[PDB]
């Protein structure tokens, strides 16, 4: 409510208090001005953050070890085009039925916040989350680190969304660098570390 803003001296939009984690008053196009949309965009930002972080660590760490020798994992940009134990199109069907189910229940939870906290096969199992986007329970917060004081939950979720935002620019950078340069990300960083003033986005 008196927090640092993405634009010091500017005035934050009325729909952004500071009660949301990662609230820095940035929405110059009013994409979240309607409260119904702002709640949907929070959930969309949360899942974009969590997929980007898994994706970032899934392309930066494995490529970081193959550039050496600890791993031999192929280029992240081409790992999809190679063949596996079954064909790629069977893996995609198994992915949809498995991810669609998990996505379906998350969807139901967004539109009806308490309806899917109970295990449909063994109704003894239950999730523990109170807020949409933080399902809790044993399967997603087995340590109990998700249930804390609202002061710590504000920071912990701000750490969550900040790491997810950075990961989003990073993953999108890894996709763009691989097309403008011609190698992997670990190569780009060393090249820029070999000569910082010249080995950049300029080649001409």
């Amino acid at each position: 409510p008196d927090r640092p803003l993405w634009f010091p001296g500017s005035t934050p939009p009325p729909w952004l208090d500071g009660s949301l984690p990662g609230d820095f008053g940035f929405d110059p196009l009013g994409l979240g001005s309607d409260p119904e949309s702002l709640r949907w965009n929070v959930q969309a930002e949360l899942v974009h953050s969590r997929w980007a972080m898994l994706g970032a660590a899934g392309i930066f760490i494995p490529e970081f070890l193959t550039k050496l020798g600890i791993l031999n994992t192929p280029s992240w940009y081409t790992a999809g085009e190679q063949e596996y134990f079954t064909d790629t199109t069977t893996l995609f069907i198994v992915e949809l039925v498995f991810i669609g189910w998990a996505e379906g229940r998350r969807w139901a939870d967004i539109l009806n916040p308490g309806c899917v906290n109970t295990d449909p096969i063994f109704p003894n199992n239950k999730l523990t989350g109170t807020d949409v986007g933080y399902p809790g329970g044993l399967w997603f917060d087995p340590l109990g680190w998700g249930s804390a004081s609202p002061q710590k939950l504000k920071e912990l979720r701000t750490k969550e969304i900040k790491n997810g935002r950075l990961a989003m620019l990073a993953v999108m950078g890894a996709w763009f660098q691989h097309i403008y340069t011609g190698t992997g990300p670990i190569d780009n960083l060393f090249a820029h570390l070999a000569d910082p003033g010249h080995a950049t986005i300029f080649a001409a």
Partner: protein, 216 residues
């Protein structure tokens, strides 16, 4: 004193303006029907800001040319203004970075400073408010956007009282005006002579009759 003033320019230029010579043959700072960037408060700021950069430029665009001809900086770093990489077809030089990579660092650093500076013109009380490495203690301005002062911009305490500040503002203004004409001088002398400004100053002493604006 009035430099080609008129009895309509005197109606709004009340002398309460550092450098108020009454000069306005086109009625630009007329407070009747202002808007956009044609505005009295803003034009004074633009006169000052352009004046300050020209003072850095008029000296810097001739400092390596002067220091080099004497032999004070290496002859491989002493250059004329239009041959340092600013205009690649006229001259380049291998700095520690590419000529375009340097501009990104420039606009990145010049961005932060010029962006924060604009907020003291818009919201005067700002910049000192939002955290900034504790440096925000000397970013609160002064109620004057063009003369913020403080520990960062007036660290020595000049303009101590009334009669000193207005005498300082008046000299600060007239210098930028001549430096701006100097910046204007370096530009046309470059395109018409093809040589540096300090050399143009030289050949007008070695032969004033045959080295002139009329010979080119």
């Amino acid at each position: 004193p009035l430099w080609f003033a008129s009895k309509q320019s005197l109606s709004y230029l009340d002398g309460s303006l550092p450098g108020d010579y009454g000069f306005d043959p086109l009625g630009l700072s007329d407070p009747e029907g202002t808007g956009g960037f044609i505005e009295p408060r803003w034009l004074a700021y633009g006169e000052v800001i352009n004046g300050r950069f020209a003072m850095l430029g008029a000296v810097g665009a001739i400092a390596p040319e002067y220091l080099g001809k004497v032999g004070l900086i290496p002859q491989e770093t002493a250059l004329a203004w239009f041959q340092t990489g600013v205009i690649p077809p006229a001259g380049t030089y291998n700095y520690w970075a590419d000529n375009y990579t340097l501009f990104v660092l420039e606009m990145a650093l010049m961005g932060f400073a010029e962006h924060r500076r604009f907020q003291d013109w818009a919201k005067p009380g700002s910049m000192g408010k939002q955290y900034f490495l504790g440096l925000e203690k000397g970013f609160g301005g002064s109620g004057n956007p063009a003369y913020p002062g403080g520990p960062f911009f007036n660290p020595l305490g000049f303009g101590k009282d009334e009669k000193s500040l207005k005498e300082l503002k008046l000299k600060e203004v007239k210098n930028g005006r001549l430096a701006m004409l100097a910046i204007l001088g370096y530009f046309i002398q470059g395109l018409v002579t093809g040589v540096g400004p300090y050399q143009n100053l030289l050949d007008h002493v070695a032969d004033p009759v045959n080295n002139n604006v009329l010979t080119s």
